[PDB]
Design a protein around this ligand. Structure first.
Ligand SMILES: [Ca+2]
Ligand SMILES: [Mg+2]
Length: 223
């Protein structure tokens, strides 16, 4: 997250770290047994780390649980990034408490201008590279469909939204991929793509989760 602030410890209790020897992506706990993330984050082996604040220090509240199933959206396109969504089934259920909690799926799509919270352990520098120990947060609005589609001509599908700021300086980055955008208590976005991060007129693009509630629930029920 560029231009964010350090979240209060465990204040984002649905945020997970996906680990393959090191943190590589975020995700969101949406059921005791299931995490949702981005398909461009796929790896064949993943350890899910729940209840993290400092991903470099074992502070007590962590639950480390291996992925048992990793299911990318059948219509994921790695060129256009359409349907950039993936489900991970935990090998055992997360134990839900104040520091490890599910986030609701959308009840509807979000209005333009809705305030959201974006979080992750991705790159914090707008030049170079700095990968934080502590979870970072960013408040950002759902952008107008003038602002989003004008920023990426011909590239915003019906399954994408932009969330952020056209002036630059505030965005999600590499390593935030797969993490949450939560607006009014609902998971509306998954960190997906853009053009670098925090550049002028290149707001972050996010998978539009309000299109996927059927796919998510059908996958959960069948696995
Ligand atoms: Ca930790
Ligand atoms: Mg580090």
């Amino acid at each position: 997250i560029v231009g964010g602030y350090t979240c209060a410890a465990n204040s984002i209790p649905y945020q997970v770290s996906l680990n393959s020897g090191s943190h590589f992506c975020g995700g969101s706990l949406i059921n005791s047994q299931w995490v949702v993330s981005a398909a461009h984050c796929y790896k064949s082996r993943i350890q899910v780390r729940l209840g993290e604040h400092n991903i470099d220090v074992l502070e007590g509240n962590e639950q480390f649980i291996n992925a048992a199933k990793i299911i990318t959206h059948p219509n994921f396109n790695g060129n256009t990034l359409d349907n950039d969504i993936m489900l991970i089934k935990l090998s055992s259920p997360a134990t839900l408490n104040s520091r490890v909690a599910t986030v609701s799926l959308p009840r509807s799509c979000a209005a333009a201008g809705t305030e959201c919270l974006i979080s992750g352990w991705g790159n914090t520098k707008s030049s170079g590279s700095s990968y934080p120990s502590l979870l970072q947060c960013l408040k950002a609005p759902v952008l107008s469909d003038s602002s989003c589609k004008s920023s990426y001509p011909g590239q915003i599908t019906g399954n994408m939204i932009c969330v952020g700021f056209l002036e630059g300086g505030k965005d999600s980055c590499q390593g935030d991929s797969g993490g949450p955008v939560v607006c009014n208590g609902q998971l509306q976005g998954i960190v997906s793509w853009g053009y670098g991060c925090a550049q002028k007129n290149k707001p972050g693009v996010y998978t539009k989760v309000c299109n996927y509630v059927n796919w998510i629930q059908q996958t959960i029920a069948a696995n």
